[PDB]
Amino acid sequence: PDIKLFGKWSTDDVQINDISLQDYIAVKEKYAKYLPHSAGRYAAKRFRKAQCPIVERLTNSMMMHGRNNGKKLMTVRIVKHAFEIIHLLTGENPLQVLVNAIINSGPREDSTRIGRAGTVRRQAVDVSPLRRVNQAIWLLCTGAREAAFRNIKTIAECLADELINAAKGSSNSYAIKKKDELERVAKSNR
Amino acid sequence: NYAVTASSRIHIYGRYSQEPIKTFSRFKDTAYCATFRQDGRLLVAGSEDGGVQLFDISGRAPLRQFEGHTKAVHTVDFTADKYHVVSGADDYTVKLWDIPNSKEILTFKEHSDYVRCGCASKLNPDLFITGSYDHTVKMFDARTSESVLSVEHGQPVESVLLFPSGGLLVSAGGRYVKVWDMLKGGQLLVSLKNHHKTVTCLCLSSSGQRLLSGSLDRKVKVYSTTSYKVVHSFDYAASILSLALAHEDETIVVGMTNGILSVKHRNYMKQRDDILINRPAKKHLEL
Amino acid sequence: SLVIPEKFQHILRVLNTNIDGRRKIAFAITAIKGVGRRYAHVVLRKADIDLTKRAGELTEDEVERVITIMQNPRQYKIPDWFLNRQXXXXXXXXXXXXXXXXXXXXXXXXXXXXX
Amino acid sequence: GPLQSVQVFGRKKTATAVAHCKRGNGLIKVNGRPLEMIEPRTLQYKLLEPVLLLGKERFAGVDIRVRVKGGGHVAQIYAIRQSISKALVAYYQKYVDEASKKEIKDILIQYDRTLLVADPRRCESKKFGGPGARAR
Amino acid sequence: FKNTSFIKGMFNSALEVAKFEGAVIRTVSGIRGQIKKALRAPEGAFRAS
Amino acid sequence: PGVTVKDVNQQEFVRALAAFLKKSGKLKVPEWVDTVKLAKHKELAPYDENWFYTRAASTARHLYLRGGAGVGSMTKIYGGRQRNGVMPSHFSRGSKSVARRVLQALEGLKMVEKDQDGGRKLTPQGQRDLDRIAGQVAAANKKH
Amino acid sequence: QPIKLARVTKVLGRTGSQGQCTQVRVEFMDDTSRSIIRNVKGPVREGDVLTLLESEREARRL
RNA sequence: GUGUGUACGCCGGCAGGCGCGAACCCCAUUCGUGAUGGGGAUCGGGGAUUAUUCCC
Ligand SMILES: [Mg+2]
Ligand SMILES: [Mg+2]
Ligand SMILES: [Mg+2]
């Protein structure tokens, strides 16, 4: 048998173009699931959340702020609707769009901080792949959340546009601008 | 299901179902030209504000808004690839837009009055036809920035349609309905007048042979394409603004000047090795 | 071509109040101070108004009918417990003097406890 | 001759499900209702995981009825999945050859071990452990 | 509420109960109790164990 | 291959039964249906004009699944959460007068009869009618 | 300067002002048999792959 | 979460009176970026309980 997300999105055609992030994005045949709801314990041990499927990680990360705490079925419905909107607008596999958005939204170099009362001084450092994936997911979720706030537009629609813009690489998305600014700050003080 | 646009409400009705199955009402004034996509999932619309709006048939708010036009917009249509939109507005211009990128691809301005009837081609992407009240029908196509062929109609062009095979373009203005072939550019093959008022709308049957024309005179004419002569007529209570045909000829829908619209629904067997002997069938005589 | 569209009242004047024609009728007729959301709904139910249409598409006869039921609720079987019967009654409040006397008594009790 | 039937339990938090599997034509019912009528439907695929993993041909010869009681919605759904999977495995062990039970069991395990083995959650935290590492 | 009961009729104000907090009280049946605190909704009511 | 009520979708069966009761007629409708709200925790009257027919269909379905229920049981079934100002929310029961008149209207159609133990239950005529509506729902779903 | 990929051979320790950074030893995927010391932010373990925009900088340099 | 201490029937919008032996969640509906159908402070009128809380 073939396992398809939500019963309609295949995982065999999805491929990852970044060698570094291949071991930290769980979408392939062993991590293929019908739903992003498994009732697993992925925070029990360090590095274990790399084995969590990336759709479930996005679903967990969309349960904010506070007013959404503990409501996972609502978030599953939001993700399903966003994937449907992505497929309608673009016509490609929404899983590939999500993978591309996560690849593009991840910063490659950050800046470490040495700070006293007067001023804080600044140094450039590298970023591990796990933190890259975590920060990409966080930036995408934050961008969707801020886009949907106090606006006549469903959170699912804003999430779909955020993923589309991030996978496109356009600067219209929140995550791309944040990554570019962080990389510019890291570059400027090498 | 059929989408009926009326005043500021776009209503989606199912088969039978006198009450609308869905309603899009977020219009301050008189939405225009609701049209389905080839997948039946998205619909383009227009508004007197000037924005082109994409709607999901299960949502309540538009997915994409296009802000290029300055005045009211009356015609919108999809392309062969189900990802681009062609629009034309009352500021005498027609624009081509991209759906995922959410920006205008291209602009055309070659018309002198209200552009209020456009069509697109299923066979060839980027090939579309538009019509205005400046009596001309201009065909913008291919990959270029100027009209390749233009067509002159004697009266304001209410409707235009493209026949799929052979490239026959039918235009309806006043009483006249004119047929133009593309094998010879600007060739008026036939002009037909069988209505005694303005021909409002024109539709094509599921089979290519039948062609339907509705008009203000509360009568709908059915033509054969091979013969180009009348084959049937329909009579209605009010003037037909809109005419629509379902799959095959299952449902015929006409939308009127007034609120009401009319829907017109339609033991053991021989084995191979056995030798077959046929018995006579009894013939029945009349009384 | 001659196609005459239906007329739409952009503004309405009901009971010396300006009503916006672009609202739905149930919400639109709550601009009156006396009228709330429930009273609007019960009045429109009594005057058999379609609730899916804006205030602008209502005919003149429909508006006068709505005014007619709104002015005479008993004649059209609207119960008294639902009505806002505001009788002219503004009685003076004598609770302030009693509260001042109670405060004086409490001060006297505190003084007596001090002694 | 004698009737062939197996009854198995599935558990999740305070939710308990009892599943009976006998010879039949492929009917699966929960509390007298079909599988597709169980709410919430958002987790409906969670309730369909074993069949999709195994195919209709393996469920074609059995009838399964489930009675679930206690707990919440999600716990009840997980208990029903566990009961169905365990009931099918037990029926194939008892009345079908052991080999097919082996492939089906290994498939159910390699997808999700929760389908067959319940692991309840205990209290383990850093607070019980002393400060620092055990060594160095 | 089992041992605890709410008593009314002994006092007429919350100032009265405050003066007699901790006092020994009893029933006609002979069960012994103690005044604990004054309540709010009846003016003289109090809580006793 | 006999279709029962439990086989078909409950929400679709409720809509079908309500329309059947409205079309067939002979169902008594109280005069105050358009002036009342269904509970004290409701803020507005129901939007649907034919809430009584939907309530009657929903009440009959519950009696099929669990018979012997009375007015109080119907009140508890249709109860819900109540928000009260700056105070925390609490559970609130439904209106007894609405449920009682629904039960009396159902009894007039010879579908609901008094229970010997207490409350009300379904007539075998009513059980036949619900099974027939269940058969139509399943047949329509399979055809489409 | 072309982007480079590196593999983590040895995790050396926790450095930086507040201990937030990790000194590791990395070797290039090119067949140049080179190895340097880098600072990494975030949880990093053995076998990870790092993307270096500029591969000439050394973490411990005068 | 059993110390001898309410299920059901009728009437009424409700609050109740009269007799007798779960929220959250999920599907759909209306609204709409406007201090707005968000929020319910303050204020006016009416009704039940034995001055008191509740209901419109
Ligand atoms: Mg909802
Ligand atoms: Mg306000
Ligand atoms: Mg308000």
User: Which CATH number does the domain G1-62 belong to among 3.30.930.10, 2.60.40.350, 1.10.3720.10, 2.40.50.140?
Assistant: 2.40.50.140
Longest dimension (CA), chain C: 102
Per the CB < 8 A criterion, the answer to whether B45 and B33 are in contact is yes
Report the residue of B42, B58, B63 to disrupt the A interface, i.e. the one with the largest count of A CBs within 10 Å: B63
Q: Which of F31, F34, F44 sits opposite C45 (nearest CB)?
A: F34
C85 CB and strand H closer than 7 A: yes
- Fill in the DSSP letter of residue A53: B
CA G20 vs. chain centroid, Å, equals 15
> How far is Cα B95 from Cα B38, in angstroms, rounded to an integer?
21
- Cβ–Cβ gap A76/D78 under 8 Å: no
| Measured distance CA(A12)–CA(B130) in Å, rounded | 44
Question: By C-alpha distance, which of A20, A99, A18, A15 is closest to A54?
Answer: A99
Q: What domains does chain D contain, in order, with CATH numbers?
A: 4-136 (3.30.230.10)
Q: Do the beta carbons of residue D14 and residue D71 sit within 8 Å?
A: yes
- CA atoms within 13 Å, Cβ hemisphere of A151: 13
CB contact at 8 A, F90 and F138: no
Q: What are phi and psi of B115, to 5 degrees?
A: -90, 110
Strand H nucleotides within 7 Å of a protein CB: 3, 6-17, 22-27, 29-34, 37, 40-41, 44-47, 52-53, 55-56
Question: How many CB atoms sit inside 10 A of residue D93's CB?
Answer: 16
| Those residues with Cβ within 8 angstroms of residue C107's Cβ, 6 or more apart along the chain or in another chain | none
- Asked whether residue F9, judged by its CB, lies under 7 Å from any atom of the DNA or RNA strand H, the reply is no
Q: Is F4:D32 a contact under the CB 8 Å cutoff?
A: no
Burial B20-52 (b: 16+ CB within 10 A, else e): bebebebbeebbbbbbbbeeeebbbbbbbbbbb
φ, ψ (nearest 5 deg) of residue B74: -125, -15
Residue at shortest CA–C1' distance from H12: F97
Count other C-beta atoms under 10 Å from residue G2's C-beta. Answer: 6
Provide the chain F residues 36-65 that lie in CB contact (below 8 A) with chain C. 44-45, 47
H/E/C letters for each residue in chain F? CCCCCCCCCHHHHHHHHHHHHHHHCCCCCCCCCCCCCCECCCCCCCCCCCHHHHHHHHHHHHHHHCCCCCHHHHHHHCCEEEEECCEEEEEECECHHHHHHHHHHHHHCCCEEECCCCCEEECHHHHHHHHHHHHHHHHHHHHC
Do residues D15 and D79 touch, judged by C-beta distance below 8 A?
A: yes
Q: Measure the CA angle with vertex A73, ends A69 and A79; round to 5°.
A: 100
Check residues 26 to 55 of chain F and report those whose beta carbon is under 7 Å from nucleic acid strand H: 32, 36-37, 40, 47
The maximal CA–CA distance of chain D, rounded, in angstroms, is 68
Interatomic CA distance for residues B272 and B257, integer angstroms: 65
CB-based contact E33:E25 (threshold 8 Å): yes
Residue carrying the six token digits 């939007």: F47
Q: Give the distance from CA A65 to its chain's centroid.
A: 17
Mark out chain A residues that contact chain D at CB-CB < 8 A.
1, 3, 6-7, 34-35, 37-39, 41, 73, 76-77
The Cα–Cα gap between C71 and C68 comes to 5
Strand-pairing partners, residue D56, are none
Which A residues between 127 and 186 have a beta carbon under 7 A from any strand H atom?
150-152
**C36 alpha carbon, closest ligand:** 3
Least Cα distance to F59 among F104, F116, F7 occurs for F104
Instruction: Give φ, ψ of B22 to 5 degrees.
Output: -145, 165
- Cα–Cα nearest to D34, from D71, D63, D5, D73: D63
Instruction: Please state, in angstroms and rounded to a whole number, the distance separating the CA atoms of residues G13 and G31.
Output: 27
What CATH number labels A5-188? 1.10.455.10
- The CA distance from A79 to E29, in Å, is 69
Angle at B18 between CA B13 and CA B21, to 5 degrees: 35
**Cα gap D15→D74, rounded to integer Å:** 9
Q: Among candidates F107, F128, F111, F105, which has minimal Cα distance to F30? A: F105
Pairing of strands B199-204, B73-78: unpaired
Please name the amino acid found at residue C29.
I
Considering only CA atoms, which of B213, B271, B211, B268 is closest in space to residue B240? B213
Contacts of G20 (CB under 8 A, 6+ apart): A112, A113, G14, G41
